[PDB]
Design a protein around this ligand. Structure first.
Ligand SMILES: Cc1cc(OCc2nnc(SC3CCCC3)n2-c2cccnc2)ccc1-c1ccc(S(C)(=O)=O)cc1
Ligand SMILES: Cc1cc(OCc2nnc(SC3CCCC3)n2-c2cccnc2)ccc1-c1ccc(S(C)(=O)=O)cc1
Ligand SMILES: Nc1ncnc2c1ncn2[C@@H]1O[C@H](COP(=O)(O)OP(=O)(O)O)[C@@H](O)[C@H]1O
Lengths: 755, 126
């Protein structure tokens, strides 16, 4: 019906004054890339930017950065007017003034440090009365455009002088400072923030709708996870982006108050939040205000918990107050808090992933002049076990180390050192290495739920196994309707069996990666720990985690560890039943409605596995992972040696074919030994050359020789001299024996219905 | 949806229905963003909560009482079990006859036994 066609959305690419549009429609907007585009927002304001095309952008909405969005005063999910304007006018002595309370970050000259590096060749169209953010000197300064020779807007070009003021001026209060938290500042969690945004949009973004429709929106959300995961960040960003009035109920803030009037503070906070519609009440450290009852005989603790319960149940559906809470784990707060209507929905922020850690690194490293040597990927990979707060601390430590090495060495320090000198220093990769050496998590214990990054390329061959895994996992999700049509319920359970080191864990990770489903790996040591400690109730917690991360692929690697611990094959006097496997069976039987979670088991000793594991509703689909073939061996060798620099002269196919029955582990060991031999030779040769050369100063030429720059053939012969066959033919005999026993009997091959 | 909602309670079902309604309102309706203090009813009448919404809600249900033991009148009938005529007859005797005709059991001074034990090969439908 002739819509506006312009919507507000988050920006994926790092850029200011740039707006992305959906690639499918260029004639509708009638503008392709690289053209000034005007945009009308609200309250009689407009902005000018440059338009590009993004394949990921949805046609319905137009991705845009937070700076431009603040300029328009629009918010995420809003609808505004767009107007393709090929016309654009240059400017003369474009004027800029310091704005807001941002001050003391610059000394002496204040225009060469920030404006010049950014407006040089940027061609960013500047309009009267807009604020644009400049990043530099480990700082962010927003500059207002108050004066300009042409009106109302002009595209900046490298031919217009800049008028210098250097006098900061307070910005209008109704305007929102861009230093406040937002969606961009909150990374590493991805799709939990989407769930919270969907959860909170209608109650806050469209409040009047719920007054004309009778339905209850979510008024209680429990953000729970390890400390430092950004739960407070999520709450603040949701409050700011939706415009809701954010109120912070600090856990120990009320609890430090004298008994009998701290309840007064809680009630006053609830009343104040109710007074201003819509609002968000964030109870930080909720496990301190309303913790586990009876295991709390204080006396006033019970009163405070009851007051909190009355307040939560006292929400009269008036206003649009959303009560969000922060807790380390759902099991730490009083269960009565988790009832319906109080906190009926929980989001597990959890530790970030490798990509999450990387993104957190970019958010925390953006004003510091990250060095050119660093790329932030190696640090992210090595930062396993850290949380977003840990990454921020690591970045701050790296910045401080850089400031200590350079800069402060001279000791030319004053009340506010000149910015540009700090711009001169870049945080080098050595600083990041030192910070990683001084990181010390801090959340290394927590279980990791990640979308595995291994792909089918990493796993060589296994075409039949790969196809069945695709069938079982991908087909039900991709075509649920067709599974419903034939009245067949897809089985939820696989069991990989085969010789050790054949890549069952990698196969499970690859199948999880293809479906883009989180992967939870329960190794043998964890099951053995639950067995020795006689704590098998943690299996229930594991399954709950799988439920929270659904869709997920719960993989139980080396599931036969407990059977081996009880005696191996002969075992004890008892049967195959054990506590941990029994709990797993109970959970698997009850874990049928979820549909998302997929259970994969791996075992190198299928004979000793409990038969109840294989009953219907359990890991019915047994898959034999045999030793890699010649093509599989070639693929495994190529995958192992991809990172290492291998000379083209070495014929890897010959090595793969010569390895008659080596497992994947054996091939990896051979590759590692070859790399070690190459490294030892390089270190010894370079060192012995340097030792001789250092005797005479400058003696030999300055020629930059690389004695060994790639793994040579001789290194591969050196490696093969120690080649070992991990898997004996007798236990392969046992695997084929179990596969035969599992075979569908005999005599029914020729079965045919009568014609 | 009812069959797939095993483990939920009445409140859970209400929450699922509310979530489906909100998802339907989000897909259509609020996409245009033509919202006021009280949007016109009939447009909301135009939108019907589609089965895709219910599927999504079930995907976002998360019981909430899945642990509790279930006491249900089983919906399987004798048709589902093939043959077993003799076994079916004795089960009818032992269970149904005492309840249907307590007076006749009282007349002969016999107290019906309360306990059966099915034994046989696995998977035969006990
Ligand atoms: C159609 C259907 C899909 C389904 O799945 C949906 C699903 N989502 N994520 C997953 S898994 C996760 C995805 C990320 C990685 C792994 N799944 C799933 C479930 C089971 C097996 N494989 C996948 C379940 C069960 C059914 C149905 C089949 C028959 C009948 S009736 C009338 O008795 O005949 C009723 C219902
Ligand atoms: C007449 C009688 C009925 C009875 O049952 C009643 C009953 N209601 N629900 C059930 S079971 C349930 C129904 C839903 C499914 C299953 N029952 C029941 C009890 C025992 C065996 N089968 C059924 C018990 C015992 C007696 C009596 C028999 C002999 C004597 S005297 C003088 O020593 O000779 C005294 C008392
Ligand atoms: N996922 C994340 N993305 C970006 N910054 C994060 C993230 N997690 C933590 N941080 C940083 O660590 C700080 C502390 O985390 P915070 O959320 O305030 O504590 P809590 O998790 O207990 O609520 C935050 O102020 C933020 O700067």
């Amino acid at each position: 019906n002739r819509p506006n066609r312009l919507i507000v959305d988050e920006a994926i690419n790092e850029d200011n004054s740039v707006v992305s549009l959906s690639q499918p429609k260029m004639d509708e907007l009638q503008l392709f890339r690289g053209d000034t585009v005007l945009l009308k927002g609200k309250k009689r304001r407009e902005a000018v930017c440059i338009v590009l095309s993004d394949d990921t952008c949805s046609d319905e909405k137009i991705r845009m950065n937070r700076v431009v969005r603040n300029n328009l005063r629009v918010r995420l999910g809003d609808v505004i007017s767009i107007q393709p304007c090929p016309d654009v006018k240059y400017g003369k002595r474009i004027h800029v003034l310091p704005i807001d309370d941002t001050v003391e970050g610059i000394t002496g000259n204040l225009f060469e440090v920030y404006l010049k590096p950014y407006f040089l060749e940027a061609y960013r169209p500047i309009r009267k009365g807009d604020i644009f953010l400049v990043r530099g000197g480990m700082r962010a300064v927003e500059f207002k455009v108050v004066e300009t020779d042409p009106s109302p807007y002009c595209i900046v070009a490298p031919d217009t002088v800049i008028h210098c003021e250097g006098e900061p001026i307070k910005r209008e209060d109704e305007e929102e400072s861009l230093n406040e938290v937002g969606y961009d500042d909150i990374g590493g969690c991805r799709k939990q923030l989407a769930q919270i945004k969907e959860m909170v949009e209608l109650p806050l973004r469209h409040p009047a709708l719920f007054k004309a429709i009778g339905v209850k929106p979510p008024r209680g959300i429990l953000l729970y996870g390890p400390p430092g995961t950004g739960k407070t960040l999520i709450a603040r960003a949701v409050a700011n982006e939706t415009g809701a009035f954010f109120f912070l109920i600090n856990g120990p803030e009320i609890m430090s108050k004298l008994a009998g009037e701290s309840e007064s503070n809680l009630r006053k906070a609830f009343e104040e939040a109710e007074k201003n519609a819509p609002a968000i009440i964030f109870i930080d450290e909720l496990d301190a205000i309303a913790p586990k009852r009876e295991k709390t005989h204080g006396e006033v603790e019970r009163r405070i918990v009851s007051q909190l319960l009355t307040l939560m149940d006292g929400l009269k559906q008036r206003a649009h107050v959303i009560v969000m809470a922060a807790t380390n784990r759902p099991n730490s707060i009083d269960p009565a808090l988790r009832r319906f209507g109080r906190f009926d929905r929980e989001v597990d922020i959890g530790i970030p992933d490798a990509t999450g850690r990387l993104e957190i690194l970019q958010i925390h490293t953006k004003n510091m002049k990250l060095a050119d040597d660093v790329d932030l990927e190696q640090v992210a990979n090595e930062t396993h076990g850290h949380v977003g707060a840990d990454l921020a601390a690591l970045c701050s430590e790296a910045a401080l180390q850089a400031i200590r090495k350079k800069m402060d060495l001279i000791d030319l320090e004053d009340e506010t050192i000149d910015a540009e000198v700090m711009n001169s220093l870049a945080v080098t990769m050595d600083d990041f290495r030192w910070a990683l050496s001084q990181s010390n998590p801090s959340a290394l214990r927590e279980t990791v739920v990640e979308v595995p990054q291994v792909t089918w390329e990493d796993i060589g061959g296994l075409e039949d196994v790969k196809r069945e895994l695709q069938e079982l996992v991908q087909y039900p999700v991709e075509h649920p309707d067709k599974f419903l049509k034939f009245g067949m319920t897809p089985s939820k359970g696989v069991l990989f069996y085969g010789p050790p080191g054949c890549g069952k864990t990698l196969l499970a990770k690859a199948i999880a990666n293809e479906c883009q489903a989180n992967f939870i790996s329960i190794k043998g040591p964890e099951l053995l720990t639950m067995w020795f400690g006689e704590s098998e109730a943690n299996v229930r917690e594991i399954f709950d985690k799988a439920r929270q991360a659904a869709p997920c692929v719960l993989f139980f690697d080396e599931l036969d560890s407990i059977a081996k611990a009880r005696g191996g094959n002969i075992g004890d006097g008892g049967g195959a039943a054990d506590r941990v496997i029994n709990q797993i069976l109970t959970e698997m039987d009850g874990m049928s409605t979820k549909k998302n979670v997929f259970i994969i088991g791996a075992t190198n000793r299928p004979d000793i596995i409990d038969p109840a594991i294989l009953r219907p509703g359990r890991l019915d689909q047994l898959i034999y992972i045999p030793l890699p073939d010649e093509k599989s061996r070639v693929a495994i060798l190529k995958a192992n040696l991809r990172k290492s620099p291998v000379a083209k002269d070495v014929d890897l196919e010959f090595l793969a074919k010569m390895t008659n029955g080596f497992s994947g582990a054996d091939l990896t060991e051979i590759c590692q030994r070859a790399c070690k031999l190459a490294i030892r030779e390089s270190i010894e040769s370079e060192i012995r050359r340097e030792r001789e050369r250092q005797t005479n100063p400058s003696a030999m030429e300055v020629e930059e020789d690389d004695p060994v720059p790639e793994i040579r053939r001789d290194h591969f012969e050196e490696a093969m001299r120690f080649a070992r066959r991990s898997v004996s033919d007798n236990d392969i005999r046992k695997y084929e024996m179990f596969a035969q026993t599992l075979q569908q009997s005999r005599g029914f091959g020729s079965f045919r219905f009568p014609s």
